């Protein structure tokens, strides 16, 4: 081990779920050495989505964001690995798919920032909050084999 093991939140957003890219996206996580240690498919209620993005409730984009993130089922996951927060963001690419590097999830599975295929926690601090929002601690499944 050379970097601290971290946990970060992934969401496969309703666009990428609807286009059946869950496996492709998961496979990218695993290829990069991250471990999926929790996952569940959910259709977010309005309150679920509003609570997750509560920091931004007064922002102009909030309504559309909440509508999109409740428009179809998502997959929420916890990814574990060395340097996971930044490693995940590297795989994801830039938040804006138009700026995302070739071969990244945003570049390959999205075209615009409003529907950009996947979420990743921005920081170690925000990951702790985001994971706790969707998962009980005892829901997370450490590897035992």
Q: Which residues are catalytic?
A: 119
Say which residue the tokens 């050495």 belong to.
33
**CA dist., res. 94 & res. 72, Å (int):** 23
Does 106 count as an annotated binding residue?
A: yes
Does the protein bind a copy of itself through residue 39 (CB under 8 A)?
yes
Does the protein bind a copy of itself through residue 120 (CB under 8 A)?
no
Does 129 count as an annotated binding residue?
A: no
In the bound complex, what is the minimum distance in angstroms from residue 144's beta carbon to a copy of itself?
Answer: 5
Give the interface segment with a copy of itself, choosing from 71-79, 85-93, 96-104, 124-132 (CB under 8 A).
Answer: 71-79
Q: Which are the contacts of 52, defined by CB distance < 8 A and separation ≥ 6? A: 44, 69, 130, 133, 134
- Of the candidate residues 43, 57, 59, 129, the single one contacting a copy of itself (CB under 8 A): 43
- Cβ atoms of 84 and 6 within 8 Å: the answer is yes
Between 28 and 106, CB nearer to a copy of itself: 28
Size of the chain, expressed as the number of residues it contains: 145
Does the protein bind a copy of itself through residue 141 (CB under 8 A)?
yes
Distance from chain centroid for Cα 88: 9
67 to each of 33, 48, 96, 135, how far by Cα in Å? 33, 11, 19, 22
98 to each of 10, 28, 76, 95, 111, how far by Cα in Å? 20, 20, 24, 9, 6
Does the protein bind a copy of itself through residue 91 (CB under 8 A)?
no
Between 58 and 143, CB nearer to a copy of itself: 143
Residue numbers belonging to the annotated binding site for ATP: 13, 61, 89, 95, 106, 116
Task: Enumerate binding residues for a copy of itself (CB under 8 A).
Answer: 14-15, 17-18, 20-31, 35-43, 71-73, 75, 141-145
């Amino acid at each position: 081990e050379f970097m601290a093991i971290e946990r970060t939140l992934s969401i496969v957003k309703p666009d990428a779920v609807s286009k059946n890219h869950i496996g492709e996206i998961f496979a990218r996580f695993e290829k990069a050495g991250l471990k999926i240690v929790a996952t569940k498919m959910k259709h977010l209620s309005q309150a679920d989505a509003e609570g997750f993005y509560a920091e931004h409730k007064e922002r102009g984009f909030f309504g559309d964001l909440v509508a999109f993130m409740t428009s179809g089922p998502v997959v929420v996951s916890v990814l574990e690995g060395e340097n996971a927060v930044l490693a995940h963001r590297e795989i994801l690419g830039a938040t804006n798919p138009k700026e995302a590097a070739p071969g990244t999830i945003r570049a390959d599975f999205a075209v615009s920032i409003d529907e950009n295929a996947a979420h990743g926690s921005d920081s170690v601090a925000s990951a702790e909050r985001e994971i706790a929002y969707f998962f009980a601690d005892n829901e997370i499944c450490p590897r035992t084999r």
